[PDB]
Symmetry: D2
């Protein structure tokens, strides 16, 4: 399923993002002057199941979760440098049941253990000055699609 | 290469669209009450190499070409009904050297013999009330990619 | 649909290979000392709709057709060199209605106008000392599959 | 990289199967009357890193590991029923660093925590009466490839 996810907006998913689901987010641009750029996977109750905060200014990408009216938990941090490939950078998120896998354009996959036991009903995209295009292209799968060779 | 092509706008291609090239256009929506929706492949000199006029009202899709300041040639027409698959309809255009292949979601491909011997430098998208999303997602390849098994 | 096509053997297709169909043939090896290696697309009546004779020693690839009991027609020839990429070379055949498209690993596509107006029911593979593996992997599609971004 | 893995045989990988690697195993057949069918991922020292024993008669798929000259460890079991899709069933194995993901045609993936900390140098296939074709097609990637749309 193809969605166009606009900056400072969200897309309501046709079906729950749940174990086996794959979200392939692709940008048509890389804005080198972009600031903190965020993607959130939200439950129907607006709990933030997976928060991805890309922060060029701190050279970090931060992962976290929080309940709608609750506090942020411990942060899981990785370096920002050499993760994205211009001019079409990407983020791929896969739900593995007990954890999410997050893949950027370079480096090994990041794994983030689930903290809130709910499926996602929406994906949100926030930035005052995005690193990426508005919208981003998002293809969401219920399961890994058949793979091309080589 | 990924482009976001907005309605009543165009995208300037990073490289010439030429023999072997593939453009996969995908919409995030289908607006069944939409009106005439147009895609043009344009040369650097703004000649319309391939014009695709999708007309729900006349129940036809019209293919044509014209020079920048010239007249339209003879029309090539096919039925509009049962060509598109909501909610993510698509148009795939392939340059076969002597002719373009155009494939929608249903039916056999349309083949359109080239009339203007130039490569395309841009793709334009026009509609007052589009059948499709704005933008559409466009992936352009210099050659057919490795294919998944399904 | 996946088939394993062995040397000096054939595969009977589950469905007719007809307009829009795609056959992606892939080898697990390349024996550069191999001899003439042939693929045939056969109708139910055993007419050879498309014959591909790959001849390293003559430095040509020859395309032709013939009826079951018939003489070969005129040959359509291209050079052999600079077509195949080791160690997993490929041949992709697409039925465009009035002609076949044949793509190797390098170079522009070859187009071969249809001579016998029948669909293919089988694909055969013959060689005394094949350039390719036994079997080759063959994925056959009724229409071009959705394409990866790269 | 494409391999043809024959029954009661193995393939030596051109590169180590290691974190981020993907092996897509595809059969050209499903033999309904077939018996216990095994795939092993082996290290260069012939330790069995991942053993997959598919047992139609017992309605189970058993996962385990053992050193070359060592005994099996504790088993991890899942149901066999409705995991495979005729006529081209598949198994996809992905190395996630601390664990393997194993995905069949239906149901949720199986995750198997690594027991022996070595990369795999070969994949073996064993059966007296295989559920699957001989060979099976195996495409091995160093990283997840770009994904086609749904
Ligand atoms: C019969 C011809 O023999 C020699 O003249 C070759 O140089 C020609 O190409 C012909 O060879 C035959 O060609 C047909 C296709 O036209 C088949 O490939 C046949 O197997 C081959 O012997
Ligand atoms: Mg009009």
């Amino acid at each position: 399923m193809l969605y166009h996810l606009f900056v400072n907006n969200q897309v309501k998913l046709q079906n729950d993002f749940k174990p086996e689901s794959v979200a392939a987010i692709r940008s048509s641009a890389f804005n080198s002057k972009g600031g903190t750029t965020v993607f959130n996977f939200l439950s129907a109750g607006e709990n933030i199941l997976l928060h991805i905060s890309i922060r060029p200014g701190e050279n970090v990408i931060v992962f976290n979760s929080r309940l709608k009216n609750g506090a942020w938990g411990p942060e899981e941090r990785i370096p920002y440098a050499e993760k994205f490939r211009p001019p079409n950078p990407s983020i791929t998120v896969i739900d593995h049941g007990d954890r999410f896998q997050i893949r950027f354009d370079y480096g090994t996959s990041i794994y983030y253990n689930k903290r809130i036991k709910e499926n996602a009903a929406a994906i949100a995209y926030n930035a005052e000055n995005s690193l990426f295009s508005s919208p981003v292209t998002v293809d969401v799968h219920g399961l890994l699609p058949p793979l091309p060779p080589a």
